[PDB]
UniProtKB/Swiss-Prot annotation:
Function: NQR complex catalyzes the reduction of ubiquinone-1 to ubiquinol by two successive reactions, coupled with the transport of Na(+) ions from the cytoplasm to the periplasm. NqrA to NqrE are probably involved in the second step, the conversion of ubisemiquinone to ubiquinol.
UniProt keyword annotations, A-Z: Ion transport, NAD, Sodium, Sodium transport, Translocase, Transport, Ubiquinone
GO function term, MF aspect, one: oxidoreductase activity, acting on NAD(P)H, quinone or similar compound as acceptor
Family of this protein: Belongs to the NqrA family.
Subunit structure: Composed of six subunits; NqrA, NqrB, NqrC, NqrD, NqrE and NqrF.
EC number: 7.2.1.1
Catalytic reactions of this protein: a ubiquinone + n Na(+)(in) + NADH + H(+) = a ubiquinol + n Na(+)(out) + NAD(+)
Enzyme class at the top of the EC tree: translocase
Encoding gene (name): nqrA
Included stretch of the parent chain: 13 to 328 of 446
GO biological process: sodium ion transport
Species, as recorded: Vibrio cholerae serotype O1 (strain ATCC 39315 / El Tor Inaba N16961)
Keyword rRNA processing attributed: no
Protein name: Na(+)-translocating NADH-quinone reductase subunit A
Keyword set includes Transport: yes
Length: 304
């Protein structure tokens, strides 16, 4: 019902993007910008006062037009209006170098680029501490919900970036990296501490000694792109599905894309509920929240 075609095409033009404050567990923001500031791509917008060092950066260059706040001044979203192509650039390497890079050097670049936020601890589901390490980084490269985009199609376009990302993770972990996938074959890291777990909603192992980190396949592609090119890779391939979508399919877009602009001239007439993420485990994309969640790879539209 509203199932998407597993074929990638271009999404509607995006004029504004936003980072959503409340979707980061335990995050209390310290602003590094105000309305009117021109920002570059990968420029810090704010940091977490309760997770010292974690940076949240702009997916695009442009101008800060809104800092929306709700009950008790909680940060709802920082809206950026796209303009120009100025960006903060980082160190670049060759693919063969990535698996041997120093762990702290890797950390520094992920933090300053903002990509560090892609990681979440399991349990607690919050961004790891900068000075912390993990023995088991899990890569979610599968999805059971038919409304989700099949990862293999996305990854097949970004083969070298995906593998490069895995190689960075293989140096970042103190133990192993686990690629959680279906039977369908994927590009393989040549590093011996990168394993594939084939299956036939995820659960992660718990231990008093260690904590598990999780990261989705598209962020792994971003990590790979970051270290190969030295630029923040903000492309997204998201599932645009739901019974009121005229051509349910996969569309290219940008992190934090305006969802009202993304679905413009995509939906049947009548009033609808736009949802960022899965239908059952997403958030109501309305008003100040009408933007693609950091950890969402799907946009669901229903009838109200």
């Amino acid at each position: 019902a509203g199932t998407p075609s597993q074929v990638i095409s271009d999404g509607k033009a995006i004029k504004k993007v936003a980072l959503l404050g409340e979707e980061y567990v335990g995050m209390r923001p310290t602003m590094h910008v105000r309305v009117g500031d021109e920002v570059k791509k990968a420029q810090i917008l704010f940091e977490d006062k309760k997770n010292p060092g974690v940076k949240f950066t702009s997916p695009v260059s442009g101008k800060v037009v809104e800092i929306n706040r709700g009950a008790k001044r909680v940060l709802q979203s920082v809206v950026i209006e796209v303009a120009g192509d100025d960006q903060v650039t980082f160190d670049k390497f060759e693919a063969n170098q990535l698996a041997s890079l120093n762990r702290d050097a890797i950390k520094t670049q992920l933090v300053e680029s903002g990509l560090w936020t892609a990681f979440r601890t399991r349990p607690f589901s919050k961004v790891p501490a900068i000075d912390s390490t993990s023995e088991a980084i899990f890569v979610t490269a599968m999805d059971t919900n038919p409304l989700a985009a099949e990862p293999t199609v996305v990854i097949n376009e970004q083969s070298e970036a995906f593998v490069a990302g895995l190689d960075v993770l293989s140096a970042l972990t103190t133990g192993k990296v686990y690629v959680c996938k279906k039977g369908t074959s994927l590009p393989r890291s040549q590093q011996p501490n990168v394993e594939e777990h084939v299956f036939d909603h995820f659960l992660y192992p718990v231990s008093a000694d260690h904590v598990a980190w999780s990261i989705n396949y598209q962020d792994v592609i971003a990590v790979g792109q970051l270290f190969l090119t030295g630029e923040l890779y903000t492309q997204r391939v998201v599932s645009l599905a739901g019974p009121v979508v005229n051509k349910p399919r996969l569309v290219r877009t940008v992190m934090g894309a305006s969802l009202e602009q993304l679905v413009d001239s995509e939906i049947m007439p009548g009033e609808v509920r736009i949802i960022s993420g899965s239908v059952l485990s997403g958030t109501k994309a309305t008003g100040p929240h009408a933007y693609l969640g950091r950890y969402h790879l799907q946009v669901s539209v229903l009838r109200e």
